[PDB]
Write a protein that binds this ligand. Structure first.
Ligand SMILES: c1c[nH]c(-c2ccc3c(c2)OCCO3)c1
Length: 279
């Protein structure tokens, strides 16, 4: 399948070169997989989700996304125009309030919720969790992310936007999950992206167009935007039978575009997420 005039990040994940604008992908499109977006919620009624999005849990007075951040991330995972995996099922878990903030105890509860809740969903091709959130180092937060991964969910987490080593942030610093840095349309490390030995992969993170609340769209930047590219890619590859939840991060790194990013510090991987789709 070919999507013309796609957002640059989708085109990038199916290309050996920057600077193109068509996204190429197998039409299976993540059908039969599920992706949990653990964030501020998802505006499920947005036409871009085609009925494939639903809220499954909130810790606040509403499950609605009153912020936009979670809707934008969910759109990068699986919306019809802005998503990597255009036929996946999207499940929203609102651990962040409408200002984008949340207590670690709530975030931990949300991760343990997903580890159990997947047993209440139909995801024959596998389950992914996208965590575009974090804060300072916490062993408890890292342990919750490791449990979610161990339970059979491909966990992708944002590296953080501090232009610093991700070892001091959580869940970014958890070794067993997939920690995602951000790049720009010229294959430069995004100026804000964290780095370090704990990163597993880079994805498009600067000027990413996706869904927004009020049935709208907008372009924003962050490692929060790169993470759902990798989460959607995992769901797409799992549907194709090329990998499993336990191995998807390693598979994405093994099959990535290698050595093509600039301004990557010594000791950080130079790997850019790539679907290896041959049209
Ligand atoms: C080769 C030439 N310059 C660099 C470099 C150095 C320090 C860095 C960096 C990149 O990216 C950000 C963290 O600090 C490698």
């Amino acid at each position: 399948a070919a999507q013309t005039n796609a957002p640059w990040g989708l085109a990038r994940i199916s290309s050996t070169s920057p600077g193109t604008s068509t996204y190429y992908y197998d039409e299976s499109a993540g059908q039969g997989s599920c992706v949990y977006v653990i964030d501020t919620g998802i505006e499920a009624s947005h036409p871009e989700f085609e009925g494939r999005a639903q809220m499954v849990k909130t810790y606040y007075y509403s499950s609605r996304d009153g912020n936009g951040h979670g809707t934008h991330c969910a759109g990068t995972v699986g919306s019809r125009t802005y998503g990597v995996a255009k036929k996946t099922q999207l499940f929203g878990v609102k651990v962040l309030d409408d200002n984008g903030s949340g207590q670690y105890s709530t975030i931990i509860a949300g991760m343990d919720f997903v580890a159990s809740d997947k047993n209440n969903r139909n995801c024959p091709k596998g389950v992914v969790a996208s965590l575009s959130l974090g804060g300072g180092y916490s062993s408890s937060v890292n342990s919750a992310a490791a449990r979610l991964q161990s339970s059979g969910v491909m966990v992708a987490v944002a590296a953080g936007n501090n232009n610093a080593d991700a070892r001091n942030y959580s869940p970014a610093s958890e070794p067993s999950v997939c920690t995602v840095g951000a790049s720009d349309r010229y294959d430069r490390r995004s100026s804000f992206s964290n780095y370090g030995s704990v990163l597993d992969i880079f994805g498009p993170g600067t000027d990413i167009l996706s869904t927004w609340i009020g049935g709208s769209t907008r372009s924003i930047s962050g490692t929060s935007m790169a993470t759902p590219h990798v989460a959607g890619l995992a769901a797409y590859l799992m549907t194709l039978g090329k990998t499993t939840a336990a191995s998807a991060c390693r598979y994405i790194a093994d099959t990535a575009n290698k050595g093509d990013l600039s301004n990557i510090p010594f000791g950080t991987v130079n790997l850019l997420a790539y679907n290896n789709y041959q049209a």
